[PDB]
Each structure stands twice: as structure tokens, then as C-alpha cells.
Design a protein around this ligand. Structure first.
Ligand SMILES: Nc1nc2c(ncn2[C@@H]2O[C@H](COP(=O)(O)CP(=O)(O)OP(=O)(O)O)[C@@H](O)[C@H]2O)c(=O)[nH]1
Ligand SMILES: Nc1nc2c(ncn2[C@@H]2O[C@H](COP(=O)(O)CP(=O)(O)OP(=O)(O)O)[C@@H](O)[C@H]2O)c(=O)[nH]1
Ligand SMILES: [Mg+2]
Ligand SMILES: [Zn+2]
Ligand SMILES: [Zn+2]
Lengths: 173, 168
């Protein structure tokens, strides 16, 4: 356990109420958050989406990526399921940070794609640590998970990070 | 100057392209960002909105506040003006932080209100003044419905020459 559950409140949205849970990294103090829809108790695998924070897409209407659409789509599918979870993993730009993501777009505003745009900035393809997400699930009393994703390689990674993914689920975007 | 302009890229949106500029606090390393629409040069006062980051409202569709609507409304009015700036001031929950904002809602989910162990507003807007300076901006036409904000922001060093109602 690298996180601690520090608080929760009712988050009213156009899909209904979500229980929003605040998490704090024990070692850094960094925050992360989860949105719980419905009753997640029960031996029934829980439908969940692991979303990595993307300021530009998530809040600034960026068309340069589909993060915002994926975010809305996940909440919708979770609402339609009536029971689910969305982990808002606050590791901006694949854990390199917002500023680095901007200077990556700055380089992409020249040609080079995502991969070499980071090797140039000193980072690898993906610098993220999903064990934190596994910790959030644990703190939420969640075991078996039906993961919302269109990338099969993600399931390999998240289960690898310690998440008991018993089933996959495509995202409508 | 407490900030440094570290990078910029084209930010395509449904209103067109914005030049997004990344800023870094010299003392903390914390980031902040600005979105520039059109050509902000010229002695003409610049229309701008100072938005304080609110994760729940800005990205998580929270109805518990109108931060998200204000955010969209500002970008729209700026787009309609054809020249403007939006400062995304990353001081969550009035500078107390996201976690504290959640445990505040937790109390509001109880009895207390938005004023009960921090003050009313812990924010420091001098950083915003710094972003404008780094953007080569002087005179500002501020987008806001709160007149008391103009007093505060000009106080923080922003040459606000006009308050402009933010239509939502
Ligand atoms: N270094 C870069 N990071 C980016 C770029 N565009 C988006 N991102 C970051 O990548 C993260 C999301 O992209 P992923 O491709 O990881 C999407 P997710 O993790 O949600 O995978 P899927 O479920 O398979 O869709 C998110 O944290 C963004 O901030 C880019 O051009 N460069
Ligand atoms: N502690 C609290 N912070 C809040 C609450 N509602 C919003 N906020 C936070 O306050 C910040 C912005 O809200 P304000 O009401 O201060 C809006 P601003 O200061 O930008 O005023 P205007 O220009 O008039 O729009 C933002 O960072 C929010 O996360 C609340 O009930 N309690
Ligand atoms: Mg605001
Ligand atoms: Zn993105
Ligand atoms: Zn808010």
C-alpha cells in the first residue's frame, strides 16, 4: 500500500451521483481520485476505467488527443452499467508531467511522433506506475475487475501492476 | 518574476487554435498554463479570463459548482472576440488543494459552509500577473462577474482597465 484514502464526498453529475474518493501518496503527498457509481460491493466483478489525467484533453477541449472523449465515454458506460469505478490517475503526460507534454507537442509541431518525442526529452514511451491504481482498488475494497479499454496491451500491464482483471470491455469512442 | 515560460505548442480546439504556453514556478516547480487566442500584440487592452483550476468542475462534470461552465463560457467569449487569453491558474480549491476541497465538500455534506482550518481565499494572484508579463501583456479587460475580483487582481499587480461580464 503506497496510498491512503483521506476523504470522500458526493459528486453530483448529469449521470447522477458518484461517490468521489480522495487518495494521497504516502511518500509524495500527491493526490489521485476515484469516482464510484452505484454499489460496488458484491462478489460480482466491477466495471472500471483507469483514466490517466490529461489536462488539455480532459479540461481544455483539446482536439489534439481524445482523452476528453474517452473520459466522457467511460463515465457514460459506467452510468449505463449502474455500478462501476473510474480511477483518475493523476500522472500527466504518461507520468512525465504537463510541461513535458507541452514541449513534446512543441516537438511534434515539427514531425516526430510520441515515442521519439520523449526519448529526446529523456523519457521512455510510458513512465507510468499503475501499482498506485491497484492500491486505489484495494482501498475501495475491489478485487475482480472488468476493465474498460480498447487496448489489449493495457490489460497485460494493469494486471501486471497487480490488478485482478477478469474481463475486458471496449470503449465507445 | 516568480515564474518562467518553459514551452508552447499549438492547442487545437472546437473554437480554433490556441497557443498554449507552459509556465513553471521558479521556487516550487509547480506548473500553470495559458491559452492564447489570436494576436495578443498591440496597444489594445487584451481580453482575458483568470480561471482557477477546479478538477471536479473542469474535468469531472461536477454540478456541485459551475467551474466547468465558466471555463467553457470564457473560451467561447474569447473565441468570439478573436483575441484573448485564459490563464489556467493551477491553485486547486482556492489554493488549499484538491484533497482539502473534497474534505470541505465532505463537511458541506454535513453542516458547515464554504467558510469553515484555512481562510476564505488562500490564493496568490501575483503569479497570474507574472504570466501576463511573460506573455508581454499590460492592459487587461478582465472577464468576470465578481467586481471584487478586479480589486484583488489589480491589487496583485494586473493592470485591469475594464471588467467584462462573463455570460454563461
Ligand atoms: N508524452 C505524451 N503523452 C501524451 C500525449 N497525448 C496524450 N498523452 C498522455 O497519455 C495518457 C493517456 O494516453 P494513453 O495512450 O495512455 C490512453 P489510456 O492510458 O487511457 O489507454 P487506453 O485505455 O488504451 O485508451 C494521458 O496521461 C495523457 O496525458 C502525447 O502526445 N505525448
Ligand atoms: N473551499 C472551497 N473552494 C471552492 C468552492 N467552490 C469553488 N471553489 C474553488 O474556488 C476556485 C474558484 O472559485 P471562485 O468562486 O473563487 C471563482 P473566481 O475566484 O475565479 O471568481 P470569478 O472571476 O468571479 O468567477 C476554484 O479553484 C475552486 O476549486 C467551495 O464551496 N469551497
Ligand atoms: Mg474558476
Ligand atoms: Zn491527451
Ligand atoms: Zn469548482
Amino acid at each position: 500500500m503506497q496510498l491512503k484514502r483521506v476523504a470522500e464526498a458526493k459528486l453530483p453529475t448529469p449521470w447522477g451521483d458518484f461517490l468521489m474518493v480522495g487518495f494521497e501518496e504516502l511518500a509524495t503527498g500527491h493526490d489521485h481520485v476515484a469516482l464510484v457509481y452505484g454499489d460496488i460491493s458484491g462478489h460480482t466483478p466491477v466495471l472500471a476505467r483507469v483514466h490517466s489525467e490529461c489536462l488539455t484533453g480532459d479540461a481544455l477541449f483539446s482536439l489534439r488527443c481524445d482523452c476528453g472523449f474517452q473520459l466522457e465515454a467511460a463515465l457514460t458506460q459506467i452510468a449505463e452499467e449502474g455500478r462501476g469505478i473510474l480511477l483518475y490517475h493523476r500522472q500527466e503526460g504518461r507520468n512525465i508531467g504537463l510541461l513535458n507534454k507541452i514541449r513534446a507537442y512543441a516537438l511534434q509541431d515539427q514531425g516526430y511522433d510520441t515515442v521519439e518525442a520523449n526519448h529526446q526529452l529523456g523519457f521512455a514511451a510510458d513512465e507510468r506506475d499503475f501499482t498506485l491504481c491497484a492500491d486505489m482498488f484495494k482501498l475501495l475494497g475491489v478485487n475482480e475487475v472488468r476493465l474498460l479499454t480498447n487496448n489489449p496491451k493495457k490489460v497485460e500491464i494493469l494486471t501486471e501492476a497487480g490488478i485482478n482483471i477478469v474481463e475486458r470491455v471496449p470503449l465507445i469512442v
